[PDB]
Every structure is written in structure tokens, then in C-alpha cells.
Structure 1
């Protein structure tokens, strides 16, 4: 396949970026998108140009650091996959593919296609856990979790932290990520002691980190690799309303180190 690529090239955080065009004469349909970018990077290195920088570890759709806005869609045209799971058989000969990073104020761009998603880390640090210490846990079968609740909490817990919800959200909102974690912890009996605090804290942190609000649009769910539903946001909304009824107020925000 002959593929034209318009790739965002930014030198660093401060340098303005621009689209550079790269023509790949031979592209394997079986080639994954990141493998095609690797071939392009090898060609650029051999030609004396700077290779394109993109985040990738697992190439399996699980780690969550592949994060590319391909042809206007986060993680590419095909849904319920990641950038790494996208292969060139999803495109045609002569196609032009525009490759971008995540665009969000809270996801600063460090390089051509690499963003800084540590705001998700700080959202997690703001109560996205169960405050249980090592050695204090009871027997693993002491608290029953119904198979339905466990399945729903595993559906929400399957979140690879890619930030594609933020990238596809018109408001740049981290509501799908936050709602997924809130739902995962709130559906289990272990997450009950903190849940009404946790949601508030987490929501406040998402405000503090610079994310936008939720207009209930649904592009987050459309581009989610793990098909995390909008019921997670409904659950987070219920938790926040219940926490407001209980007078729960957010703690101090997690300031970056």
C-alpha cells in the first residue's frame, strides 16, 4: 500500500508544532500502525531526519500509553481497540492519514506525538483507591461480592488510562476515566467506606488539573478501547449528588511534584 502521513511534529513543550508530510511507498496491510510508524522512523533515521516520537510499551492494548489521534479519531478509525491494535488493513491504498497527539490543556505535548498524562496519575492520587494497608486485609472470602457487581466493577476497572476520552471529548474532560475508577471502587463492598469522599475528591482533582466539564456528549465512550459505558458517568453523578446531600467537601488538591 501507498500511504501518505501528515504527522504532527513538535520539538518540545514550548516550540510550536506543524504537520509534516511523509510518503510511504510500501505499507503492509498486516503492518500495525505503530509498526508502520517504526518503519517511517527507520527511514527518517537513515535519511538524516528526526524520527517521530510516540508513546508505546505493550503493543497489546492493555498498558495504555499508545495514544494517537488518527484521522480525527482517538486510537484510529476502528473502535474498541488502541493505536497499537490498529493495523494498516483498516486503510486503503493512496489514503492520507493525519496523526496527532492528544489535545488537552491537562495533557501537555512533550514531543511530536507524546503527551503528558500525569494529570490522570494525580486524579488517581486524589482518592482513586481503597485506603487499606498491607497486612490488615481479612480473609479473601469474608465479604461476598455478587457476580453482577464484580462483573460491572471489572467492566469499569478495565481502563488502561490512555486519555483517549479526554482527547475525543469536545470539552477535554476526564469524566470517563474518573467515572470508571469511581464506579470500579463504588461497586465493591471494600470501596464503600470512602466512596462519597472519593468521588468528590476525584472530581475536584479533575477540575484542578485543567480538564473540562461533561456535556453528556459521548465521544469518550465512542473511542474508549475498553468500551467503558456512559453508565459509569451516571454512577459517578449519583455518587456526587449523594455526597453533596451528605455535605462531603473535597480535600486539598494533589499538587504536582
Structure 2
């Protein structure tokens, strides 16, 4: 399996980058994409060039650090999987594969394929939580939560924060991430006391951070590794409309340190 790769190569944040081609002869069909990149990096180090840099921690599609735009589609051609879970059995002999990072104003590029995703952290910091201090919690079985509500909350709560929704969205919007967090916290009773403020704050933060708007295109849900449905965005819209009917004003934005 001979594979030709076109990898984006950028020295640093301010230095412009370009595509470079690397041809590799033997590629095991059952090894993952990241391991192929590792073999390429070892070959580059042996030859004497600068190795390709990319984010990877767990290699199980749970941590959410993998971030690659492969052949134009986020996380590789196969759906509902991350970049670390993509194997070369999904490609063809003699194929040409184009590798790029995410592209957004809120996700600055730091290296060849590494981006800065602290914008998601800042979105979380502006209300994406439940304000309960340690030691004050009541007993576990005090508040009943129906099985359906808990299941939907778990479906929305399994977001690995990869940022592929921003990369797939033509507008570069973080609506799926924000909607998933809002839906998770809004489907449990413990999230009731401050939900109508919460959503507003979170939405404002995204606008403050540099993300686009949502045209309901739906491209985000097609590449989401954990298959977050588009009904989270509808839930966020309902919450924001109800908050606007209550005269809820957004707080001050979270300025980065």
C-alpha cells in the first residue's frame, strides 16, 4: 500500500505555511493513521528534517485531543470516529491523502497541525457548570431523575471537546459544543436554578470569542465523533428564547489571562 500525503507545514503562529508531499511505500492496512504519521516522523528524523507535530494523548477517541482534517472531512472519511480511531484499511492503494489542522479565527495554529483550542475552555468558564461547593451536597437519592431525562443528558454530555464541529461548520461556529453543554446541564434538576442565565452567558462568550453564527446547515452533526444530535441546538434556542422573555442580561465576558 503506497500512500502519498500532502501535509500542511507551518513553522509557528506568525510564519505562513504551505503543503508538502511525502511518499511512503509500505503502509500496513491495519495500523491507525496516527501510527503512520509516527512512522513518517521517524523517517523524517532519520533523514534530517523537522518532524510533523500533532496532538494526541489517549488514542482511544475519548480524550478529544486528536484534531485532523483528512481528505476534506474532519476526523477522516469514516463517521462517528475520531482521528485516533481511523485506520488505513479505510483507504486505497496509491491514494493521495491531504492532512490539515482546523481552520478558524478562534483556533489559532501553533505548529504544523496543532491548534489552540482554549476558546472552548473559556466558553465553559462562563457558566457551563453547576455552582455547588464541596461538602454542601445533599444525599445522592434526594432528587429523582427520570431514566429518559438522564439518558438524554448522558447523550448530550458525552462531548470530548475535540473542536471538529467548529472545523466542519462553514461559518466556523461552536454551536454544537455550546448546545451540548447547555442540554446536558438543562436536563437534570440540579441544573435548573441557573439554566436561563447559563445559556445566555455561554452564548455571549462564543460571540465574544470569535465564532460564527449557526445557519442550521447541519454539517457539524455529520462529523461529530460522539453523534451529538441537532436537537441540542433546538434545546439551546428554546432556552435562549425563554431567557430573553425573562429579561436575562449576559454578564461580563471572560477575558483570557
TM range (shorter): over 0.9
Q: Report the CA distance between 1:4 and its aligned residue.
A: 0.6
Which residue number in structure 1 is paired with residue 73 of structure 2? Answer: 73
Q: CA RMSD in A?
A: 0.5
CA distance in 2 between counterparts of 1:58 and 1:248 reads 40
CA distance in 1 between counterparts of 2:63 and 2:194 reads 27
Q: Report the CA distance between 1:24 and its aligned residue.
A: 1.1
Q: Report the CA distance between 1:249 and its aligned residue.
A: 1.0
Deviations 1:169-218 (A, max 9, x none): 00000000000000000000011111111100000000011000000011
CA distance in 2 between counterparts of 1:188 and 1:95 reads 48
Secondary structure class of the residue paired with 1:19: strand
Give TM-score, length-normalised by structure 2. Answer: 0.99
CA distance in 2 between counterparts of 1:242 and 1:92 reads 51
Find out whether 1:101 has 2:116 as its counterpart: no
Q: Report the CA distance between 1:55 and its aligned residue.
A: 0.3
CA distance in 2 between counterparts of 1:221 and 1:67 reads 16
Secondary structure class of the residue paired with 2:89: helix
Q: Report the CA distance between 1:141 and its aligned residue.
A: 0.7
CA distance in 2 between counterparts of 1:90 and 1:128 reads 37
Flag structure 2 segments of 5+ consecutive residues without an equivalent.
none
Aligned residues: 257
CA distance in 1 between counterparts of 2:90 and 2:23 reads 18
CA distance in 2 between counterparts of 1:230 and 1:120 reads 19
CA distance in 2 between counterparts of 1:128 and 1:81 reads 25
Give TM-score, length-normalised by structure 1. Answer: 0.99
CA distance in 2 between counterparts of 1:196 and 1:56 reads 36
Q: Report the CA distance between 1:84 and its aligned residue.
A: 0.2
Secondary structure class of the residue paired with 2:8: strand
CA distance in 2 between counterparts of 1:23 and 1:31 reads 17
CA distance in 1 between counterparts of 2:193 and 2:34 reads 43
Deviations 1:91-141 (A, max 9, x none): 000011100000000000000000000000000000000001100111111
Secondary structure class of the residue paired with 2:193: coil
Which residue number in structure 1 is paired with residue 83 of structure 2? Answer: 83
